[PDB]
Design a binder for this molecule. Sequence first.
Ligand SMILES: [Ca+2]
Ligand SMILES: [Ca+2]
Ligand SMILES: [Ca+2]
Ligand SMILES: [Ca+2]
Ligand SMILES: [Ca+2]
Ligand SMILES: [Ca+2]
Ligand SMILES: [Ca+2]
Ligand SMILES: [Ca+2]
Lengths: 228, 227
Amino acid sequence: SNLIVGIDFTKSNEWTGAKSFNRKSLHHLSNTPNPYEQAITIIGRTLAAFDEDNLIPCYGFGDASTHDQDVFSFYPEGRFCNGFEEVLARYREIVPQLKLAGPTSFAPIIEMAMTVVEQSGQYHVLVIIADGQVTRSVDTEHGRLSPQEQKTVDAIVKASTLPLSIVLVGVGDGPWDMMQEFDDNIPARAFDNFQFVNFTEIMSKNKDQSRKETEFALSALMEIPPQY
Amino acid sequence: SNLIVGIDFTKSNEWTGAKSFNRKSLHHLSNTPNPYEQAITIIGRTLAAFDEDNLIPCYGFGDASTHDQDVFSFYPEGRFCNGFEEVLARYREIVPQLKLAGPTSFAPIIEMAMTVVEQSQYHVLVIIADGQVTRSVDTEHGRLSPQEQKTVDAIVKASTLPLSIVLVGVGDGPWDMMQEFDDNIPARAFDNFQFVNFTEIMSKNKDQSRKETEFALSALMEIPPQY
Ligand SMILES: [Ca+2]
Ligand SMILES: [Ca+2]
Ligand SMILES: [Ca+2]
Ligand SMILES: [Ca+2]
Ligand SMILES: [Ca+2]
Ligand SMILES: [Ca+2]
Ligand SMILES: [Ca+2]
Ligand SMILES: [Ca+2]
């Protein structure tokens, strides 16, 4: 198995840390690791074993350079991060230059993972670290969903015929209704290829750190098919 | 959720380590951990992370004091173990005092687990065992040995509670009967019994941490989708 990492850089990260991060942006850099740093770090400690070559494709999405249309690679060319040590380091280099934007769709990151799978038909797990706030639609002229939620669901459906599992690592306050829906209720799906894990909730419990980290890791891999 | 542990102390453990443990008893104490200790330790590092309060009801069964009728608590007035570090330490304290015996049945441990569930919110019962439940050729017992029949009956009755049973198999096997409890019990409300071959998983030559997670994911594989 190999890992793929996508990181949400949309503007909603500015306010989804109201309760869980003392009204600082989830991407704020300072004396203490923000929830994205914490997740990258713990993923490195607990899930990195499930990447066979320890090379990690990392992508960002939803900043002003990509909006809801594209992703960007952490490194020029098709060059990958060497371990989650470098994932974290590169995140910290990149964050100060980014203008957080939107709208929010998972279509571009899921399409990028589909391309990674075809560059390999080997099994992959895509890990998206995100605040859960995909663009919502209040409008009957739009149709049922926002175009972002429609495109995202369509990408999740298209990916479900590939050897790919998706894991949403949720950081911040939520709400988590949309992620829980992607987790449990996408009907046109070939198989259940989306798992939601509430990282911020798990890490806030009164248990030993190492037990919290293990609870996170197993919750993350809980829907990975039997055959692995 | 909450994790309950039951450990098999029947006499078959004296021979079910013939291949996997170089002809030593599976409960042999030394300066290297036996398969029960290996399993306790890995369960503590993995599955036990979910236990809400880190207090773990622990029981043994199948020694001379309980035979196929009862379990014994690791601690006097049913005091729970404080974390899996204490589960392991207490196991090591207890084993030298036990006379391994029989017959072998899972009815007592499953009945105890039901009692625990009823007094409590999801539970996982982990039974660490060599798989050798008492068999019989004699059909004056009915189709199954009294032990196997009472065990099946307990599994079925437990299936109406928020409880999943995971058999952590240690030693050589054979694993036919565990696979049957895993896959083939008719009157059951839901599939509440999973078999994991721990000795087979851990004997593979790969990264230790990946083996442990693979073990954990197998143990949790049949938890109902709700969780
Ligand atoms: Ca957003
Ligand atoms: Ca890789
Ligand atoms: Ca799911
Ligand atoms: Ca789920
Ligand atoms: Ca407990
Ligand atoms: Ca036995
Ligand atoms: Ca089963
Ligand atoms: Ca099974």
